[PDB]
């Protein structure tokens, strides 16, 4: 069981449109894990949102019906020799770093999960929290240290994936508190250049305003003309005529590499990808360049996303959007 070439299962028990059993039971099935396993991936990252495990009305009572989804996924992975990175996407409250109570629930959910899977030693790793956007890392470091401690009381050797501030930015790793612990893997997400990977992203106001098709390798066009029309996105002027190429990707990856040089730790890129509406040749090339960098620096990771979520690698018929793309991603 290795955690090097994975794929995310976003939209299943996280970022689900509607909380419906029909969805939860149909979105991901053993046939999907089989498909992923067959394609050559070695693990899947599974983001989950709290409510499918804990309801705000009766805090502390965990849902077996919700848990059955994680349990069954674990069973499917074991059968196909895949690893599973259980990832908490949305946590209690964001008020989490404000409200002591939301923090208590956060650590208790992890304490509960550590016990629940205490006998699974090689197929599961825990990834604490994705959603982190703070002015600085002081409060996340406090909560994170408390969370590691609680988990360690129960399981001294479970692998814990920890990311930094600003959505696990690679330049925020240096701001995390020192964790003298041998079973930690440091996580970072990578979506650079943002306007290429999220070109026309409906959810990005800035991307939706700019509204431009971007090729890779290539460059940002009409930035100056766009800012002129939209003074509100003046900050974008810094990107005027930016050249998008492999050297740009290596530059953006440098902060994670430096951090590792100092901490002598393991790194993991839990999310990276290109919006599916981008031209295929560019979409393939970006992944190819990025994966070559991950391979060069020996960094494992998981591409966003398996199906749907606008970053699909596979269609609903469980067939890859491109075989070359999957081959690249399976390393």
With beta carbons less than 8 A apart as the criterion, state whether 151 and 111 touch: yes
Where b means 16+ CB within 10 Å and e means fewer, 91-106 reads bbbeebbeeeebbebb
- Tell me how far apart the alpha carbons of residues 161 and 127 are, in angstroms, rounded to a whole number: 4
Task: Using DSSP, state whether 297 is helix, strand or coil.
Answer: coil
**DSSP conformation letters of 145-183:** HHHHHHHHHH-SS--EEEE-HHHH-GGGGGGSPP---SS
* Closest C-alpha among 210, 208, 206 to residue 225: 210
Distance between alpha carbon 35 and the CA centroid of its chain, in Å? 20
Question: Active site includes 131?
Answer: yes
Which tokens is 253 given? 């990856």
> Could you tell me whether strands 184-190 and 5-8 are parallel, antiparallel, or unpaired per DSSP bridges?
unpaired
Domains and CATH numbers, the chain: 1-331 (3.20.20.80)
Instruction: Determine which one of 54, 172, 271, 312 is catalytic.
Output: 271
Which tokens is 81 given? 């020799």
- Tell me how far apart the alpha carbons of residues 17 and 314 are, in angstroms, rounded to a whole number: 19
Give Cα separations from 59 to 49, 328, 330 (angstroms): 15, 43, 40
Query: Residues 274, 125, 86, CA angle at the centre, nearest 5°?
Result: 55
- Tell me how far apart the alpha carbons of residues 268 and 3 are, in angstroms, rounded to a whole number: 9
* Closest C-alpha among 103, 205, 94, 86 to residue 144: 103
PDB resolution in Å: 2.2
- Tell me how far apart the alpha carbons of residues 295 and 280 are, in angstroms, rounded to a whole number: 22
With beta carbons less than 8 A apart as the criterion, state whether 302 and 269 touch: yes
Distance between alpha carbon 209 and the CA centroid of its chain, in Å? 25
With beta carbons less than 8 A apart as the criterion, state whether 189 and 269 touch: yes
Instruction: Determine which one of 131, 134, 258, 288 is catalytic.
Output: 131
**DSSP conformation letters of 55-87:** -STTTT---HHHHHHHHHHHHHHHHHT-EEEEE
- Tell me how far apart the alpha carbons of residues 154 and 89 are, in angstroms, rounded to a whole number: 22
* Closest C-alpha among 118, 115, 21, 108 to residue 68: 21
- Tell me how far apart the alpha carbons of residues 227 and 252 are, in angstroms, rounded to a whole number: 24
Give Cα separations from 53 to 140, 152, 265, 277 (angstroms): 22, 22, 32, 33
Solving technique: X-ray
């Amino acid at each position: 069981v290795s955690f090097k070439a994975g794929i995310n299962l976003g939209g299943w028990i996280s970022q689900y449109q509607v909380f419906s059993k029909e969805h939860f039971d149909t979105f991901i099935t053993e046939k999907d894990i089989e498909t992923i396993a067959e394609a050559g991936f070695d693990h899947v990252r599974l983001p989950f949102d709290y409510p499918i495990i804990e309801s705000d009305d009766n805090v502390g009572e965990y849902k077996e019906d919700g848990l059955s989804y994680i349990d069954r996924c674990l069973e499917w992975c074991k059968k196909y020799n895949l690893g599973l990175v259980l990832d908490m996407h949305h946590a209690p409250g964001s008020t989490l770093f404000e409200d002591p109570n939301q923090q208590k629930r956060f650590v208790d959910i992890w304490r509960f999960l550590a016990k629940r899977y205490i006998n699974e030693r090689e197929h599961i790793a825990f990834e604490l929290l994705n959603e982190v956007v703070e002015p600085d890392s002081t409060r996340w470091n406090k909560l994170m240290l408390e969370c590691i401690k609680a988990i360690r009381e129960i399981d001294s050797t479970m692998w814990l994936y920890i990311g930094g501030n600003n959505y696990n930015s690679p330049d925020e790793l240096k701001n995390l508190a020192d964790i003298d612990d041998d079973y930690i893997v440091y996580n970072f997400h990578f979506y650079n250049p943002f306007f290429f990977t999220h070109q026309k992203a409906h959810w990005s106001e800035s991307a939706m305003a700019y509204n431009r098709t971007v090729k890779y390798p290539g460059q940002y066009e009409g930035i100056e003309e766009f800012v002129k029309n939209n003074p509100k996105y003046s900050f974008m002027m810094e990107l005027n005529n930016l050249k998008l190429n492999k050297e740009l990707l290596r530059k953006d990856l440098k902060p994670a590499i430096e951090f590792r040089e100092k901490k002598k730790c393991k790194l993991y890129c839990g999310e990276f990808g290109v919006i599916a509406i981008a031209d295929l040749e560019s979409r393939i090339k970006w992944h190819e360049d990025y994966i070559s960098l991950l391979e060069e620096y020996d960094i494992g990771g998981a591409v966003w996303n398996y199906k749907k979520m606008d970053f699909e690698i596979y269609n609903e018929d469980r067939k890859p959007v491109s075989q070359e793309l999957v081959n690249i991603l399976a390393r």
